[PDB]
Amino acid sequence: MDWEERKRLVKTFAFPNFREALDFANRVGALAERENHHPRLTVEWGRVTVEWWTHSAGGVTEKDREMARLTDALLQR
């Protein structure tokens, strides 16, 4: 599945367990630290939901889309 504007940019990533989901969340966290823009991450067994938005703007901005693309890049598909 690709990113969707739900006002936030959201995508869920599937994993075989909790451990791998948490591992991915940590990589997204490192990315957030580097770009000075943080997501809302939801980690549970087999899934990580990543949400990007800009509070001040009350929605999705170019920075959020950049973070979404950098998040997908972490998968190196």
Add this chain to the structure above:
Amino acid sequence: MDWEERKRLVKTFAFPNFREALDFANRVGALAERENHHPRLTVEWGRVTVEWWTHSAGGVTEKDREMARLTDALLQR
């Protein structure tokens, strides 16, 4: 704040940034792996929300309360 039954057992933990919130989430994850019971974790700047429930029971069980107490213990207040 103490744990509250919202059917799940929920509590939010405050932090000064995202990094420390993620660090705490990882400790809760290790705890979950040891006890074979996993929470739904929400990590964002300055906060980690921890939710415990048992799917099959459709609510909060003794195991969830045990996990809540073990989660607080991680803080070693």
